[PDB]
Amino acid sequence: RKVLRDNIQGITKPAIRRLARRGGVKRISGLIYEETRGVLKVFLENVIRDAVTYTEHAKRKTVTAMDVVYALKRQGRTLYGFGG
């Protein structure tokens, strides 16, 4: 049982660079990286907040793919491929 902290810094500068590339960006200001980590943490917090609300309502201790899919759909971000 070990303590999870600061894992937003696992979203590295190079990985962020790749995502921007896929999004078409040719040149990236130095401040973008912390900005992107902030936006991602907020997005993922919102999604996981709702997925855990579905998990708790079902009296489970295991977040399922379906809980995540329901949270994404509630928020206007429908995801295909994870209904099995």
Partner: protein
């Protein structure tokens, strides 16, 4: 020579490379740690089906890619080529994420 590409050439190459492919661009184990850290701050001792972590990662990467496209258009609009925080903020404000 010693051979050196001009700034921009290797980034254009990388745009073509990553727009052709579909692999997740964020390392898997660090992203999983991130997901468990966020979720544990909301209910201690959840487990995750690995399916649920991959669904979160697909959603997150597609969101960031989409936002970066919109950010790019905002930078182009101000007649720049370099994306900056104010471009992300303009994009998210127009999306209604935080208007």
């Amino acid at each position: 020579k010693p051979h050196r590409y001009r700034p921009g050439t290797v980034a254009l190459r990388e745009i073509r490379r990553y727009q052709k492919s579909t692999e997740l661009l964020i390392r898997k184990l660090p992203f999983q740690r991130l997901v468990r850290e966020i979720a544990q701050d909301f209910k201690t001792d959840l487990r995750f089906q690995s399916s649920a972590v991959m669904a979160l990662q697909e959603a997150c990467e597609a969101y960031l890619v989409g936002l970066f496209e919109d950010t790019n258009l905002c930078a182009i609009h101000a007649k720049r080529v370099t994306i900056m925080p104010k471009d992300i903020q303009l994009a998210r404000r127009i999306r209604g994420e935080r208007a």
